[PDB]
Every structure is written in structure tokens, then in C-alpha cells.
Amino acid sequence: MNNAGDKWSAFLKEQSTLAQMYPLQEIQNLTVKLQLQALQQNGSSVLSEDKSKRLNTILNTMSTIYSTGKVCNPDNPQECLLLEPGLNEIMANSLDYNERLWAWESWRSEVGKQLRPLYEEYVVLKNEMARANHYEDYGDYWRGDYEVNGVDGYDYSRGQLIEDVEHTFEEIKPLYEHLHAYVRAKLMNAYPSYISPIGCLPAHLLGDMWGRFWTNLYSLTVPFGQKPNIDVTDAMVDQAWDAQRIFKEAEKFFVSVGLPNMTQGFWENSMLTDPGNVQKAVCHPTAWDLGKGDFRILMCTKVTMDDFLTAHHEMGHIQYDMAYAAQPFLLRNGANEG
Amino acid sequence: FVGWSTDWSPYADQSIKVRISLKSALGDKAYEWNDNEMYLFRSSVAYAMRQYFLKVKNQMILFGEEDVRVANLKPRISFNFFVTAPKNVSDIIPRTEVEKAIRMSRSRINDAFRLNDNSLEFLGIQPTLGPPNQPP
Amino acid sequence: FVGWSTDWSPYADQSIKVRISLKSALGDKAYEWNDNEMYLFRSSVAYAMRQYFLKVKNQMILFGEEDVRVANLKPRISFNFFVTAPKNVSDIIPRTEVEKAIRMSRSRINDAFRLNDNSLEFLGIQPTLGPPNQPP
Ligand SMILES: *[C@@H]1O[C@H](CO)[C@@H](O[C@@H]2O[C@H](CO)[C@@H](O[C@@H]3O[C@H](CO[C@H]4O[C@H](CO[C@H]5O[C@H](CO)[C@@H](O)[C@H](O)[C@@H]5O)[C@@H](O)[C@H](O[C@H]5O[C@H](CO)[C@@H](O)[C@H](O)[C@@H]5O)[C@@H]4O)[C@@H](O)[C@H](O[C@H]4O[C@H](CO)[C@@H](O)[C@H](O)[C@@H]4O)[C@@H]3O)[C@H](O)[C@H]2NC(C)=O)[C@H](O)[C@H]1NC(C)=O
Ligand SMILES: *[C@@H]1O[C@H](CO)[C@@H](O[C@@H]2O[C@H](CO)[C@@H](O[C@@H]3O[C@H](CO[C@H]4O[C@H](CO[C@H]5O[C@H](CO)[C@@H](O)[C@H](O)[C@@H]5O)[C@@H](O)[C@H](O[C@H]5O[C@H](CO)[C@@H](O)[C@H](O)[C@@H]5O)[C@@H]4O)[C@@H](O)[C@H](O[C@H]4O[C@H](CO)[C@@H](O)[C@H](O)[C@@H]4O)[C@@H]3O)[C@H](O)[C@H]2NC(C)=O)[C@H](O)[C@H]1NC(C)=O
Ligand SMILES: *[C@@H]1O[C@H](CO)[C@@H](O[C@@H]2O[C@H](CO)[C@@H](O)[C@H](O)[C@H]2NC(C)=O)[C@H](O)[C@H]1NC(C)=O
Ligand SMILES: *[C@@H]1O[C@H](CO)[C@@H](O)[C@H](O)[C@H]1NC(C)=O
Ligand SMILES: *[C@@H]1O[C@H](CO)[C@@H](O)[C@H](O)[C@H]1NC(C)=O
Ligand SMILES: *[C@H]1O[C@H](CO)[C@@H](O)[C@H](O)[C@H]1NC(C)=O
Ligand SMILES: *[C@H]1O[C@H](CO)[C@@H](O)[C@H](O)[C@H]1NC(C)=O
């Protein structure tokens, strides 16, 4: 896989160098110009060798620091807790203010402090690269994914995204304020004398390590806990639903709206069930568009309603990939990243 | 109550509020409260903390002018300061110890700015006037 | 002269010698001169340097308690200090500027320690008593 990826990357880089022979100032075909833009972005190749090497080194260092981050008790440095196991359980299950505070502060003092100087250097280098690619800042380079030029009525400027996002969030704010007030009032009863009814929520009491999702807070904020939520896992078990018919049900659901059927080789090449301990494989449900009409799904599917919904999600990804098969390989992707 | 205030924090209980009245204690010939005066005030507070931790708890802690964090500065010269650990921001000295430290060395802080216990109010630390000794 | 003295240095001209007499100006009720007092003194000197560089040369220089280097401390409380650049030890502020800074803010340094111009001698900076205004 490393050899194949290296060969593909080298081919892409040399084709990017070759694509410079056609400037956009003379291309009049929209599709051809878009392919030229896709293959013409220098990216990290515009920096010097020393700068590129430093950027790759700092990126790899930050990734390794985040991956290997561990919180260790000073009394016994041998025993440490990693991020994915335990620490997330501490932040998502514990009801102790001090324990959650310790987990949060330890994670943000053992990883963030080691990342601050690397992040400063990363900011500077990314700014340098973006400016070398005729971009005002690296954030502008990121916003460029939504840029549309030369299409009447459909043009979109990179500076328009910020204003649109702020305008939309201003309309979202009324709902978020009420949700925040309800969550704060409900949390006052679980962490008394810590949640002020007039102030904000402490960062370590949001059910997750960073507060990105409030899902784990649900047990502390359920409106009517006496009424059980809609669960159909036991119903699937009673009807003996294996990890082979739920995909058929999802396919039937897709076809019910007029979307096409599944390909012949999709079921044969798929790994809809876990291969056990004999074969080692990853378990993140992913959709693969290999090309030439080869669409596959990888998923260690169990018998659960969440598994059913995830299968529907992956089948949606597969259908989206199948839809634009006739498009050029450079155009075989969604309209934007979202 | 729907909404939130951007001024409440779980560590806001440990803040001590200082109110300074330069032009009432001195009238004329009164210096202006620029950044150098704030630096001197933070140095005085750190000195008081050092004295308290040396003469009471018998611990040598190297406080500094960066360990006295100050916020909400206003033209009245009334702000909120809290003292943290010497090189560890996450640790805040509890307000009781800071109040004891201020009480111990309040005279020195008063003398550093030529203020007398009425133009330098710590809003929680009240001075003692002194017993009026009686004739025989 | 054969030999050498371990006390002469090419930058020793820029040192300013301070002599402090605590038990003469205060008699009793006089504090002891521990490390906290030295920290406060260095903070006061740095504050004076900041005030001089702000009110005369119109330059904002962030001096600190580590930029006032002190040597030859003795039980008389008489030492030699020199002020360097904020984060560059090789650069020493010339003694003339330090003397001007001390003259500008000598009253504040005197008040910080409850000394009056006779128990805090800078050995090179002499105070002015003031003209004796005459009746009509
Ligand atoms: C900079 O300053 C910051 C300060 O802001 C400082 O951070 C602190 O560092 C110390 C030292 O590491 C931390 O203390 C550790 O806390 C760990 C957290 O786990 C505990 O969290 C709760 C703490 O409550 C304590 O106090 C209450 C009141 O006295 C008491 O009731 C508790 O029992 C406890 O003693 C505690 O509730 C929590 O509870 C667990 O266990 C209960 C059953 O008892 C269970 O019901 C819970 O579900 C939960 O599982 C848990 O005990 C803690 O792990 C750690 O203890 C280990 O080490 C000590 C020795 O150090 C052993 O004695 C112990 O057995 C463990 O092996 C230790 O107590 C403190 O939490 C930090 N605070 C913050 C805010 O971060 C930084 O270190 C400073 N940095 C530098 C460089 O100086
Ligand atoms: C931390 O603080 C320290 C301070 O302690 C600071 O260090 C100083 O940094 C500055 C800036 O780099 C240094 O200044 C440089 O000095 C270089 C040394 O070469 C010169 O050395 C002699 C300097 O004498 C100067 O002043 C006298 C009196 O006014 C004057 O007569 C001289 O002409 C000169 O201006 C000088 O004698 C010497 O002479 C050479 O030329 C003569 C002919 O004129 C010849 O006969 C000699 O044989 C000899 O070849 C020479 O001139 C100097 O190179 C350098 O000048 C270059 O840059 C400046 C611009 O900056 C140009 O104008 C110039 O043309 C050169 O390109 C500059 O003058 C100073 O010496 C440091 N001092 C010490 C003690 O280290 C640190 O930088 C601080 N650090 C931080 C991070 O802030
Ligand atoms: C831009 O170029 C594309 C690619 O040539 C044009 O799309 C068609 O692509 C097929 C397959 O490559 C060709 O056989 C056709 O001749 C192309 N043209 C048509 C009209 O089908 C596309 O039309 C071009 N855009 C414009 C505006 O001419
Ligand atoms: C990419 O880099 C080349 C030189 O390395 C430069 O000429 C070109 O303008 C840059 N940008 C694009 C889009 O090719
Ligand atoms: C579509 O696929 C399902 C199973 O994948 C199959 O039962 C059905 O017959 C297919 N559709 C047609 C029209 O054959
Ligand atoms: C007031 O009383 C305190 C002790 O309660 C004492 O330390 C302080 O000096 C008194 N103030 C005077 C005597 O002026
Ligand atoms: C002594 O004279 C200087 C100016 O030469 C003056 O600044 C200082 O205040 C005088 N001392 C007094 C008036 O006590």
C-alpha cells in the first residue's frame, strides 16, 4: 500500500507540474478549467526543501504527540491512562466534579503545552505557503473549497463564506440559548454549588473531553426519563436479523425512492461481517470507490439499531459515489466537502 | 434565566477586588496610574505573598509580578486580582490565604503608594483602628 | 603590582552602591532584611527605570526584578547593583541614566521601605534639601 500510494502521489505531482502549461487566463471550458484548477494547485510543493521538511516534521510530531498523549499519576508513573480508553469514559460517565476537572486539566496540560510551540511554527509555515500560492492567509486557502468564479449567478467569493456563516449563526442563536438554559438548569441538580444559574457551563461538565458533543449529557438532561426511548435491537434479535439482511433492507429503502439497485460484485467483495480473530481488519464503517464500477463497504456490523443506521449512512455514501461514475475521475467527488 | 454572563467563572470566587482613590488621599501632587504603577502593585502583592508564606507556613515560594493576575481595570482604579502558583496557572491560592497575606503586610503596600487604609480598599479586608487606652 | 584582585571588572564602573541603615531610621519596630526585601528593592529599582524610560526617552522598556543584578551583600546592608537590558545581559544601562532614574523616583523608593534620604544612601546621588524661602 505504501508503494502504491507513493507511485500515485509521484504521478499526481508530475502531472501537476505538467498542467502549468495551460494558464487559466485562456481556458474557456468550465469543466476543463475546473480539472486544470484541481490538478494545478501546487500545495506544499511551493515551499523550499528545508521549509517543506520542517513542515512535515512538525505535522508528524503533533500527530504523534496527540496519539501518544497519556495522563500519569505522579505517585506511580508506570500506570497511565490514554485518550481513547478510560479517559473518555471518565469524561462521559463520572459524576464527580473534581475527577472530571482532573481529567480535563491533565489532558489539556500534558498535550496542549507540548503542542503550543509546534503549533506556532505550523501557523507561520502554513501562512508562508498560502501567501506563496497567492492567498492572503491559510484560512483563505481552506475557505477556497467553496469558491466559485466565472459561473453567472452561481459565483461565490472566499470572503462571502465568513459573512454567510456569521449571519446563519445569528439566526441559530435563539434556539441555542434556550437549549443552553435548559441544560444548565438540569445540570444544577447533578453538580450542585458548581453551576451558577446566571453564568456559563464549566468546560469539564459537558459530557465530552472538549465539549464538541453534548450527547453523553443526555442521561442528565432527559425530558421524561420514565418513558423509554424507541429501541428495536431486541426486536431484531427476536426475528434473527443477521448482518446480511439489513443491507438488503437498506437497498430496498433506497430503491423505493427510485435509486438504482446494488452492483453484482458489491455483495461478493464486501465484508459486511467481522472476519473474527483469524483475519485482522479495521472496524470503522467506510465506503470505498475503487473505480471502474467497484463500490464496496467495510463494516464490522453487529446486530444493533445503530448498526442499521450506520449501514444506511454508508449505503448513502455508496449511492453518492455511484451517481457520478460517468464524471471524469477528477470530478468524481461531491460538490463540496459537506 | 435565559442567556449567560461573560463575567462569571468557577474561579471568580478567589478574586480580590481593589479600589484605589489617588486624588482624594493626595489631592494635588498625585501621580497617574499607568502601567508602571500596576507593575509596582503586582510586585508589592507578590512580596506580601512571599512574606506570608515565609513567616507562617515556613515555605519558600518564589512569587513574581506575573503570578498576580489582574483584570477589570477601570478609570476609578478598581480591579480584581488573584494570585496563582509560581509557575503553574491552574493552581490558585485560596482567597483566605491571600487575605491573611494582605493583612500581614498591608502597611508596606500602603506606604509604597502613599495611601492610608481608606484610599486603598481591598473590599473584604477591613482595618482595625486600635483600642482607645483609658487614663488610670 | 604582582597579582590580581578578583573584584575588578571592566563593567564595574557602571555599578551603583547602596547602603541601608534600618535600625537608625526606625530604631525599634524595624523589619529584617531577608530575600523578600531584596526582591522588593529590585522591583522598586526596575519600576524607577521604567518610569525614567517612559517619561523622558518615550521608550516602553519592560524591565523586571531579574534585570537589576545585585552583588556584594553584607550585614550592613550595603551592596552593588547594576541594571541591564530587559532580556540581554551583555547590555548594561550606563550609570548616568541609572542615576537620573534614581533621582526621578527616589521618593517612591524611600517610601517603599519607610526610609528618608539618610538611611538609604546611593553613594553618588545626593539629595537636595530645598531653598529656604525668605520673609518679605
Ligand atoms: C498545577 O496545579 C494543579 C492544581 O490546579 C495541579 O492539579 C492537581 O494535581 C493533583 C496531583 O496530581 C491532583 O490530585 C490528583 O487527583 C486525581 C483525580 O482523581 C480524584 O479526583 C477527586 C479528587 O478528590 C479528592 O479530594 C476529595 C476531598 O478531599 C476526596 O473526597 C477525594 O477522595 C479525593 O481525595 C476524587 O473525587 C476522585 O474520586 C475517585 O475515587 C472515588 C472513590 O474515592 C470514586 O467514587 C470516583 O468515581 C473517582 O474514581 C479521584 O480520587 C487522583 O487520581 C490523584 O490520586 C492519585 O495519586 C495520589 C497521589 O498523588 C494517590 O494518593 C491516589 O491514590 C491516586 O493514585 C490525585 O489525588 C488534582 O486533582 C489536580 N487538580 C486539578 C484541578 O488538575 C497540578 O498537578 C499542578 N501542576 C504542577 C506541575 O505542579
Ligand atoms: C545585547 O547587547 C549587546 C551590547 O552589549 C549588543 O552587542 C552590540 O551589538 C551591536 C549591533 O550589532 C554592535 O555594533 C556592531 O559592532 C560591530 C563591531 O565592529 C566595529 O567595532 C567597533 C565599534 O566602534 C563603533 O563606535 C565607535 C565610537 O563611536 C566608532 O568610532 C566606530 O567607528 C564604530 O562606529 C569599531 O571600532 C570597529 O572598527 C572597524 O572599522 C574601523 C574603521 O572604522 C577599523 O579601523 C577597525 O579595524 C574595524 O575593522 C567596527 O566598526 C560592527 O561590525 C557593526 O557594524 C555593522 O553593522 C552596522 C549596522 O548595525 C553598520 O552600520 C556597519 O557598517 C557594519 O555593517 C555594529 O557597529 C556592538 O559592537 C555590540 N557590542 C557588544 C559589546 O557586543 C547585542 O547586539 C545585544 N543583543 C540583542 C539580541 O539585542
Ligand atoms: C468541455 O470539454 C468537455 C470534454 O471534452 C466537453 O464534454 C464532452 O465530453 C465528451 C467526452 O470527452 C466529448 O466527446 C464531447 O465532444 C464533449 N462535448 C460535448 C458537447 O459533448 C464539454 O462539452 C466542453 N464544454 C464546452 C462548453 O464546450
Ligand atoms: C506553482 O508554482 C509554479 C512554480 O513552482 C508557479 O509558476 C505557479 O504560478 C504556481 N501556481 C500554479 C497554480 O501553478
Ligand atoms: C435488486 O436487488 C435485490 C437484492 O439485492 C433483488 O432481490 C432484486 O430482484 C433486484 N432487483 C431486480 C429488478 O432484480
Ligand atoms: C487593630 O487590631 C489588629 C488586631 O485585631 C492589630 O494588628 C492592629 O495593629 C490594630 N490597629 C491599630 C492598633 O492601629
Ligand atoms: C532640591 O533641589 C532639586 C532640584 O535641584 C528639587 O527637585 C528637589 O525637590 C529639592 N528638594 C526639596 C525642595 O526638598
Residue numbers in the entry:
A (entry chain A): 62 to 399
B (entry chain A), C (entry chain B): 603 to 738
Paper text:
Further classifying the 2:2 ACE2-SIT1 complex data, there are two distinct conformations based on the relative domain orientations within the ACE2 dimer. This movement between open and closed conformations occurs as a 30° rigid-body rotation around a hinge at residues 612-617 in the loop between peptidase and collectrin-like domains. Further, the branched N-glycan chain at ACE2’s Asn690 is rigid and well-ordered in the open conformation, hydrogen bonding with asparagine, aspartate, and glutamate side chains on the peptidase domain’s H6 and beta-hairpin between H4 and H5. Accordingly, the glycan density is weaker in this conformation as the chain becomes more mobile. This suggests that the Asn690 glycan chain acts as a latch on the peptidase domain, stabilizing the open conformation and thereby regulating its change between conformations. SIT1 is in an occluded conformation with the active site inaccessible to both the cytoplasm and extracellular space. Within the SIT1 binding site are two non-protein densities, identified as pipecolate and chloride based on size, local chemistry, and similarity to structures of other LeuT-fold transporters. As a sodium and chloride coupled co-transporter, SIT1 has obvious binding sites for two sodium and one chloride ion. The density for the Cl- is clear in the experimental Coulombic potential map. Therefore, we propose this structure captures the sodium, chloride, and substrate-bound inward-facing occluded state of SIT1’s reaction cycle.
